[PDB]
Design an enzyme around this catalytic site. Sequence first.
Site, PDB file in Angstrom:
ATOM      1  N   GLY B  10       0.813  -1.199   0.000  1.00 32.44           N
ATOM      2  CA  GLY B  10       0.000   0.000   0.000  1.00 32.44           C
ATOM      3  C   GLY B  10       0.850   1.253   0.000  1.00 32.44           C
ATOM      4  O   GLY B  10       2.066   1.210   0.150  1.00 32.44           O
ATOM      5  N   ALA B  99      -7.958   0.274  -4.000  1.00 27.98           N
ATOM      6  CA  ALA B  99      -8.984  -0.334  -3.171  1.00 27.98           C
ATOM      7  C   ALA B  99      -9.911   0.682  -2.515  1.00 27.98           C
ATOM      8  O   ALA B  99     -10.625   0.324  -1.568  1.00 27.98           O
ATOM      9  CB  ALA B  99      -8.319  -1.219  -2.110  1.00 27.98           C
ATOM     10  N   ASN B 228       7.824   9.920   7.714  1.00 26.90           N
ATOM     11  CA  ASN B 228       8.441   8.688   7.240  1.00 26.90           C
ATOM     12  C   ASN B 228       9.939   8.639   7.539  1.00 26.90           C
ATOM     13  O   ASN B 228      10.479   7.550   7.748  1.00 26.90           O
ATOM     14  CB  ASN B 228       8.157   8.492   5.742  1.00 26.90           C
ATOM     15  N   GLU B 254      14.025 -14.569  17.889  1.00 25.81           N
ATOM     16  CA  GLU B 254      14.457 -13.918  19.117  1.00 25.81           C
ATOM     17  C   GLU B 254      13.552 -12.747  19.482  1.00 25.81           C
ATOM     18  O   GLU B 254      13.346 -12.475  20.670  1.00 25.81           O
ATOM     19  CB  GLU B 254      15.905 -13.457  18.976  1.00 25.81           C
TER      20      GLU B 254
END
Lengths: 428, 439, 54, 331
Positions: B10, B99, B228, B254
């Site tokens: 996306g 979408a 971002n 881990e």
Amino acid sequence: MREIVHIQAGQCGNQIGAKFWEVISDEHGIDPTGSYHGDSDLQLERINVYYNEATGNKYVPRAILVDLEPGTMDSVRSGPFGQIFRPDNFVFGQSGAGNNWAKGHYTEGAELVDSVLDVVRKESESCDCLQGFQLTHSLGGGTGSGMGTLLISKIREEYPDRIMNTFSVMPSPKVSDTVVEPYNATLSVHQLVENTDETYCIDNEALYDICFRTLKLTTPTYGDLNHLVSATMSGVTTCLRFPGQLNADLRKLAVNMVPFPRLHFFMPGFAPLTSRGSQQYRALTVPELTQQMFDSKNMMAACDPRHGRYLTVAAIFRGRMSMKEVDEQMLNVQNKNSSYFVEWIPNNVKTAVCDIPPRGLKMSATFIGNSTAIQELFKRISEQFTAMFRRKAFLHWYTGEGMDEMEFTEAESNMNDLVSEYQQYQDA
Amino acid sequence: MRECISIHVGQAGVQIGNACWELYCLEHGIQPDGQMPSDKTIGGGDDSFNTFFSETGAGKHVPRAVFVDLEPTVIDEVRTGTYRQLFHPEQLITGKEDAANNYARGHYTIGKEIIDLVLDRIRKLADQCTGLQGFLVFHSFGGGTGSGFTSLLMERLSVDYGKKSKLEFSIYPAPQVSTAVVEPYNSILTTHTTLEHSDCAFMVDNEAIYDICRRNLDIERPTYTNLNRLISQIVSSITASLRFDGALNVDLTEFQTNLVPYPRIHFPLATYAPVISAEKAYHEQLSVAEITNACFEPANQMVKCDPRHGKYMACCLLYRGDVVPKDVNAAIATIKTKRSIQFVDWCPTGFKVGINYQPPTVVPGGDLAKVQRAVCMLSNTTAIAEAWARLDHKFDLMYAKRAFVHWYVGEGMEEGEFSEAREDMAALEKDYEEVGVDS
Amino acid sequence: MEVIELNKCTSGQSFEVILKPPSDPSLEEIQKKLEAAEERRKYQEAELLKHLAE
Amino acid sequence: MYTFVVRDENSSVYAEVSRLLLATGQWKRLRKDNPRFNLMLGERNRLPFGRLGHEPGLVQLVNYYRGADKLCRKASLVKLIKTSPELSESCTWFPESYVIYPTTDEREVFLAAYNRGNVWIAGILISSEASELLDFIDEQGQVHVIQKYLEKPLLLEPGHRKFDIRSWVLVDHLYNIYLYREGVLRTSSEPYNSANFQDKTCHLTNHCIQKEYSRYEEGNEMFFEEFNQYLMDALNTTLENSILLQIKHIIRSCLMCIEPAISTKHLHYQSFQLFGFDFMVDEELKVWLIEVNGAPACAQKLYAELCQGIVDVAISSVFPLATSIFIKLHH
Ligand SMILES: Nc1nc2c(ncn2[C@@H]2O[C@H](COP(=O)(O)OP(=O)(O)OP(=O)(O)O)[C@@H](O)[C@H]2O)c(=O)[nH]1
Ligand SMILES: Nc1nc2c(ncn2[C@@H]2O[C@H](COP(=O)(O)OP(=O)(O)O)[C@@H](O)[C@H]2O)c(=O)[nH]1
Ligand SMILES: [Ca+2]
Ligand SMILES: [Mg+2]
């Protein structure tokens, strides 16, 4: 790209449609011949949502001109941008429809329609990603009202999964004096409830009240009205035509504005309002743009927004300004009038900013409200309809085209439902 | 050496992708064309940094990643930006129609239509992998693809790679930057369907990143770039251990052993500091004590919430720069008294610490100043349920009226997948309550 | 108050410090579910075209 | 303009607050479910703290401190004093207490100090015998606490009756501790009679159980000017020196103990909250604490003033507009 097929039908339809084209054609830098002459590549970057590519670096509106009478075809072909339309994209009859929904939908519009659908196919068939259609028309006449809603039924049947968008001009006896317009409007609203995803309600009551009062236009004209309808159309389509995040295609808009299928009737609003040729002396400050666009004096549908509740709302800002301030100001609106937004749709106001301003404005705002207060508009029409349907008055003009009383009873019931539906959601 | 596949899904996941992959390149000294003079293993080598990059006989290092948007606008910026040379055309998958911020659309309609091409394109990378350990999935909760495809892809992945780990970096919706009002719908839906296929989720709340950018970096109206870039620092702290020489967090199993005692409570809260403006005239450098304390202030967490009202089940301190245990223990000692830091009884009160001596790398001309040392904490506190409670409340306000439901139903989704998704969330909130929030 | 497993390397160090001790579906079912959705999606469109053909 | 919602319609006290706020044209009351509020007058139980402080553009204030229940639940308070090094068994203003459960348990540890004069307390059961007491709660089906019943209470005269001290403490978002200057003694009408541990009448000063039987004071409320006088006329002291010095000390000690765990200084929402502390004076004029009350009501006389003071120091301090009744407890 996601392409939109524009259809414009009837007198009203064809004249706001031509205006829309010359306004966005300027916005995008296309000249009345179809050739790009701008600077910013933001003009061209989404040009193919509304235009088509031909050799010559030439751009053809993806528009289809429809009417049951040759009059309006010839006016637009001899308008400023009359020459930038695919000439096979002019579909027109001779009879006319004589302000009769039944002739546009049933009898006259029948002959002509398949010829319209052929051009719609030919246009659609050359789309990589058709997103849907947008039709301009009026609801009070016969062609755009009656043939427009027929085309919409026929288009949904061939494209049941593309979006259907209409700018629908609503009749007002402040501007017209044809007695049967309430009939044509109710028959058309009934269709629009069932067959469109998004409808903008350009109300001629609101367009007249703005022009006459606010802009002090003593003897207004359709060119004055259509001046408000032009700016609004550019406004609410900015997010489709330049680069951006929000409401940038017809589906994503619908998923943001339509919380229930039938409640897809939008109340537009523009600030600043301007008489054409109005020398613009000062820019609006961002808090000015905000206050006005939410003000009832600034709506394009004659409904009191404080008389209902906003279900969803989209705000588009244009011109160079401060997102930090737009954001501050848009918050303050919802915070100081918080009951006017349903609390059961959180964060139901989305705000876009386009740096490129409209023509002659340094600063504008465009408002798209899905408010339960639009029941006021359907109620206005519904009461005129009833006044004369309860005596089956003027019905012969319609039954002589093969229509039947039962249809009028249906269209009326579906609209009365639409109103009760908007009202239930006013109470939570 | 064991490789990891990154999957960016996306718009949000893909834009966060280049944010990370750019940084990763700066840290390992790789250039926009895959060249890495420092690697002397020309055409291979099982070095720690090979986990994220593979090598081309010509000396190009190619991220072990695949991006996938259901529309082309964003990924086209990846096949054109500075690092276009660096990726591989076949790892940048795109569709045509997106979408429309509709989970059901991206899961069922269009999802189905491009899952196999994605799964295939992914197996391609699993082959040039001697010991693939799993995947890191980057997405948003709110968008169509980000929510609805990812959950589709997460289920094929549990089928196609059963013994493999899957980690999430997931962007929780905030209205200051959200472009859809149905986002709570998509968030609950995709959390439900994905909950059993994800071994460990790092939820970055856009609201939190956004104030961090406003308050600490003087940025008026943060753009996605600012957001971002910060997310890439935190992400690089979480993954530094998989690409550098260390003994702590050496492979993805881990991560769940260290952070996730219960399988459903697998959302550790990430907290990072210092975050300083590159333009700050002068900044007195922060100390190990000062940065480590910052980790308990809610105003540095990727999720605004109060861990004092909640218990811990794990904690990790990931230091980058000039740190030595003496200071770390010293600082722990002292915050241990001042702060309220109760673990759950069936868990030891303790911290796992890791130090990478190389200070944090900053994107030149970015917003963040270089700092002599920095820390990312990975507490698993029940207090992060606060985020679920508020998201679930927004869901409830809208679904009570059935607002917007018809968009998902019209795509084939059944009304009940709404209530079963939401009911699972109530289970989730209930477990968080049992575990923590007792004393 | 207890440093455990101190591990050192030229990149950095790693250790544990404790202060107090303690007091799935299938490609089949997946396809069975995507398809139930296009069957509903295609049924809805059928009924819609059916109306429009009336 | 400011906006508040109301979510506890049983608050005599914050019914006054909303009444005042509205009566200023500067405050509108939204509907409880409208999130776009500045102030939340907040419910008593399961108040959704998780949801506060997330609306941009809005500054949000709630009238409770998340986690102040540790101070305000009898079994929790006990554990709080016993564990917190700030209080601990060094604490000499808290009756000796243990937490007991029907059917971390201090039942063995309780008898441990039960040995040989020993009267204790759990309506509720007072008795000098472990049996009948421990088993009373051991059936009860609700965790309760065992606290040494003070055998030598200071008793007012004329009457020979016991009383009960209520102090109202307001804690704002800055963690200033305000003590309302006016307090009330909850006096007993029936002369306090030793050997009546099961009488529950003279032995209990609960404003309720006293309105059942009641005379000297209007509704058994004695205020401070009267109690000061009596303290002077007999005893030869001041209310300030003998009693209130200890009180200010106990309020400050309790609230600061928990300050690191409920301070909202650096939090995305702000809390204030009103506490009602309940004290017991004894024969030698030594103050004792029993209940800290998280949602206290106010003596009818004093509603006008305290409630305005809440608006003044606690709400308007944060949302401004366009001598002090409190004593700030300095720390
Ligand atoms: N923090 C951050 N969030 C982002 C960024 N890009 C997108 N988002 C968020 O992600 C949400 C949608 O995520 P996606 O499902 O991936 O949307 P998409 O990538 O455009 O894909 P489609 O929804 O199918 O169109 C948006 O509402 C944004 O709030 C980004 O760069 N940074
Ligand atoms: N707002 C607006 N309304 C218009 C315009 N042109 C026509 N109308 C309205 O449309 C009605 C006439 O409809 P008509 O053109 O005869 O419908 P048609 O025959 O189907 O095309 C009148 O009552 C007008 O109010 C226009 O340019 N602007
Ligand atoms: Ca080497
Ligand atoms: Mg999208």
